[PDB]
Amino acid sequence: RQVTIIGAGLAGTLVARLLARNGWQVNLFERRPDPRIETGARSINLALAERGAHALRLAGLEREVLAEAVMMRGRMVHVPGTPPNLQPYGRDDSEVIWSINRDRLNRILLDGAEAAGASIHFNLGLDSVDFARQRLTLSNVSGERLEKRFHLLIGADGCNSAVRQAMASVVDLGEHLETQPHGYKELQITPEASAQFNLEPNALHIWPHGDYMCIALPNLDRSFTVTLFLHHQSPASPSFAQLVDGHAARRFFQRQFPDLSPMLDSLEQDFEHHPTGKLATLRLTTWHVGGQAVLLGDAAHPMVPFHGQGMNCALEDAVALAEHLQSAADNASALAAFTAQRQPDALAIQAMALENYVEMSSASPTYLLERELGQIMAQRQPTRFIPRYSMVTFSRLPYAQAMARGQIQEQLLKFAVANHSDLTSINLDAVEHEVTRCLPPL
């Protein structure tokens, strides 16, 4: 059985390995050059959690990826003047996540696909698809075009997928775009600076500031990659529109992030040389065209990054697609069932990612008592009352079920605290009863 995959990023390389391993004839096309060919040219990080780690585990690559990953035990919150505060992510060191360099991951996955027998072809970008004739057109940076025949086409070509554009002209995909008002910019902290300011290596760092914020993830050599999230446009308010050059960015950091600015030795140059990125949420009602083509990963469901689950979801998609294709009656059956299974879960993580943004800078007295009570209920009923962050991050429960269980827990906590000043007035034994009455064990 034959397949053509567009995009050798994270989902495309993983599905290529899983199908080649099963004896499929796989051809993978990528517009960038091969990153494994060392050049004289001169650092993006991601958070790997259980969903992505489990996908790599099935592919037999987890140990190689984790050997180059830095453990993050929790969230380190910075407010000027005050000492940083560590919020642990899990119950113990079994529940942690991992900072992995994006380029390192992609190189490991590329080697793994070739080892399984897939053929990879770089410097070729997909331009268009002719579905009636089963041919597609690719081009190099020098504009020269060539044509190829295909039997099955997998769009793994990212948030700006050309496969999706071609599909949307022969079927109605129910596309809807929800634009995000924030852009982002990447900046660097050196190993020297991070040591000098005693920045904890085994944590994710965040500088909240309401409508804008900064995060930082660690690297193996003790450097950190910093990401600024800030509105493109002002309604007045700060925004990328007012930051005309690196010197303006420096003044903004010294005023709004005064304890982070001294760590950013190359702020001015990074700001002017790295491009400002865009964010969005894009939802589709269907991900396939008959038995001829299918989408996965960011090509199917771009999401805002505030839960750190886009790569984790894409790798989970790749496992599912390979399973459906291996055992279905025919490609058309496989693609319809893949869409039916994954699209409701992709929709749910898209919604939870947006909610995490508000959840994190955007403080309440009710919220405090609710969280005090939820910890008690998780200690008394560890099998039933499980924080939604844990369900999303450390389990493989379908996203839609994680969201539903999270909703029941929030309603129980709301009614339990309503019109109570503090825990002294609440009948904990009675709350525990409702927990058992409404939440089945897992």
Ligand X SMILES: Cc1cc2nc3c(=O)[nH]c(=O)nc-3n(C[C@H](O)[C@H](O)[C@H](O)COP(=O)(O)OP(=O)(O)OC[C@H]3O[C@@H](n4cnc5c(N)ncnc54)[C@H](O)[C@@H]3O)c2cc1C
Task: By CB under 6 A, name the binding residues for ligand E0Q.
Answer: 47, 75, 97, 204, 215, 305-308, 356
Interacting partner of 271 out of ligand X, ligand E0Q, Cl ion, none (Cβ under 5 to 8 A depending on kind): none
Contacts of 126 (CB under 8 A, 6+ apart): 6, 29, 31, 136, 137, 138, 157, 162, 163, 166
Nearest to 243 by CA among 225, 258, 255: 255
Q: List the end-to-end C-alpha distance of the chain, in Å, as a whole number.
A: 39
- The Cβ of residue 441 has, within 10 Å, a number of other Cβ atoms equal to 9
Q: State the minimum distance, in angstroms, from the CB of residue 92 to ligand E0Q.
A: 17
Tell me the DSSP string of 374-397. HHHHHHH-TTT---HHHHHHH---
Query: Which lies closer to ligand E0Q via its Cβ, residue 100 or residue 166?
Result: 100
Q: Would you say 332 is a known binding-site residue? A: no
How many Cα atoms are found within 13 Å in the side-chain-facing hemisphere of 203? Answer: 17
Q: Would you say 367 is a known binding-site residue? A: no
Q: Would you say 130 is a known binding-site residue? A: no
Query: Which lies closer to Cl ion via its Cβ, residue 48 or residue 173?
Result: 48
Query: Which lies closer to ligand X via its Cβ, residue 184 or residue 394?
Result: 184
Contacts of 9 (CB under 8 A, 6+ apart): 106, 156, 157, 158, 297
Query: Taking contact as CB under 6 A, which single stretch among the options 6-14, 239-247, 336-344, 389-397 is the one that binds ligand X?
Result: 6-14
Taking CB under 5 A as the criterion, which residues in 320-339 touch Cl ion? Answer: none
Q: Where do we find the tokens 């959840």?
A: 359
Q: Does 305 sit near Cl ion (CB under 5 A)?
A: yes
How many Cα atoms are found within 13 Å in the side-chain-facing hemisphere of 27? Answer: 13
List 310, 374, 387, 406, residue binding ligand X (CB under 6 A): 310
Number of residues that bind Cl ion (CB under 5 A): 2
Interacting partner of 156 out of Cl ion, ligand X, ligand E0Q, none (Cβ under 5 to 8 A depending on kind): ligand X
Q: Does 218 sit near ligand X (CB under 6 A)?
A: no
Query: Which lies closer to Cl ion via its Cβ, residue 51 or residue 405?
Result: 51
Amino acid symbol at 216: A
Query: Which lies closer to ligand E0Q via its Cβ, residue 24 or residue 184?
Result: 184
How far apart are the C-alpha atoms of 224 and 216, rounded to whole Å? 6
Q: Would you say 10 is a known binding-site residue? A: yes
Taking CB under 6 A as the criterion, which residues in 85-124 touch ligand X? Answer: none
Taking CB under 6 A as the criterion, which residues in 313-332 touch ligand X? Answer: 314
Q: Would you say 399 is a known binding-site residue? A: no
Q: State the minimum distance, in angstroms, from the CB of residue 52 to Cl ion.
A: 11
Residue 3 CB burial class (10 angstroms; 0-12, 13-18, ≥19): buried
Q: Would you say 184 is a known binding-site residue? A: no
Number of DSSP helices (H) and strands (E) in the chain, helices first: 14, 20
List 12, 155, 310, 387, residue binding Cl ion (CB under 5 A): 310
Query: Taking contact as CB under 6 A, which single stretch among the options 113-121, 258-266, 308-316, 422-430 is the one that binds ligand X?
Result: 308-316
Enter the tokens of residue 125: 């970008």
Nearest to 90 by CA among 397, 394, 403: 394
Interacting partner of 215 out of Cl ion, ligand X, ligand E0Q, none (Cβ under 5 to 8 A depending on kind): ligand E0Q
Q: Does 154 sit near ligand X (CB under 6 A)?
A: no
Interacting partner of 75 out of Cl ion, ligand X, ligand E0Q, none (Cβ under 5 to 8 A depending on kind): ligand E0Q
Q: Would you say 106 is a known binding-site residue? A: no
Beta strand 145-149 pairing with 135-139 = antiparallel
Query: Taking contact as CB under 5 A, which single stretch among the options 1-9, 100-108, 137-145, 305-313 is the one that binds Cl ion?
Result: 305-313
List 112, 155, 218, 297, residue binding ligand X (CB under 6 A): 297
Taking CB under 6 A as the criterion, which residues in 14-33 touch ligand X? Answer: 29-32
Enter the tokens of residue 409: 């827990």
Amino acid symbol at 421: S
Q: State the minimum distance, in angstroms, from the CB of residue 322 to Cl ion.
A: 22
Nearest to 208 by CA among 100, 44, 356: 356
Q: Please state the residue numbers annotated as binding site for FAD.
A: 10-11, 30-32, 47, 102, 126, 298, 311-312
